[PDB]
Amino acid sequence: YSIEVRTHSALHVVKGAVVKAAGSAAKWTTSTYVKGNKGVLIVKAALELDKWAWAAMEALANEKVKENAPIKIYELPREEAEKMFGEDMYDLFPVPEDVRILKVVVIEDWNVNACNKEHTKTTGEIGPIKIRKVRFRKSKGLLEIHFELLE
Ligand SMILES: [Zn+2]
């Protein structure tokens, strides 16, 4: 696999970790990016989290990785997808109304996201995930998770 394919799959794993560590008050992604072996996940955060969160997120992310869980894909009609997954599968960008069929990524009881990119078949292929930075921006109610993979 491409390092960026892996880093991108890691976004899904890391997102799930953030939600598990912080609950549903940090579950809406505003934006993300992948550059080589590095990725950044930014989510809306209603609350500042405790001193254990950063470490908790990294631990949870890596645990999901060794679990080597399958990264499922459902390519369904938009209406069926929305019924099956709800608004949860969307990020905070608009998905043109003419897109009537969605590819949605599912890591069972971890993360659900409408995404048309390539992914690893399982979480184990991602390798160790390292979170070198977590920045909470109080006034904007935004939480940034910076992480990186091994090439
Ligand atoms: Zn994706």
Swiss-Prot record:
It comes from the Archaea. Keywords: Cytoplasm, Metal-binding, Zinc. One of its GO terms (molecular function) is aminoacyl-tRNA deacylase activity. Zn(2+) binds at H8, H12, C115, H119. One of its GO terms (biological process) is tRNA aminoacylation. The keyword DNA damage does not apply. GO terms for cellular component: cytoplasm. SUPFAM superfamilies: ThrRS/AlaRS common domain (SSF55186). Binds 1 zinc ion per subunit; the homodimer seems not to bind zinc. The zinc is probably not catalytic. Another report suggests the zinc is catalytic. Its cofactor is Zn(2+). Its main location: cytoplasm. Coiled coil: none annotated. Monomer and homodimer; the dimer is less active in tRNA editing and does not have a zinc ion associated with it. Another report shows only a monomeric form. Belongs to the class-II aminoacyl-tRNA synthetase family. Editing domain AlaX-S subfamily. Functions in trans to edit the amino acid moiety from mischarged charged Ser-tRNA(Ala). Has little activity against Gly-tRNA(Ala). PANTHER family: ALANYL-TRNA EDITING PROTEIN (PTHR43462), ALANYL-TRNA EDITING PROTEIN AARSD1 (PTHR43462:SF1). This is Alanyl-tRNA editing protein AlaX-S. It comes from Pyrococcus horikoshii (strain ATCC 700860 / DSM 12428 / JCM 9974 / NBRC 100139 / OT-3). The gene is alaXS.
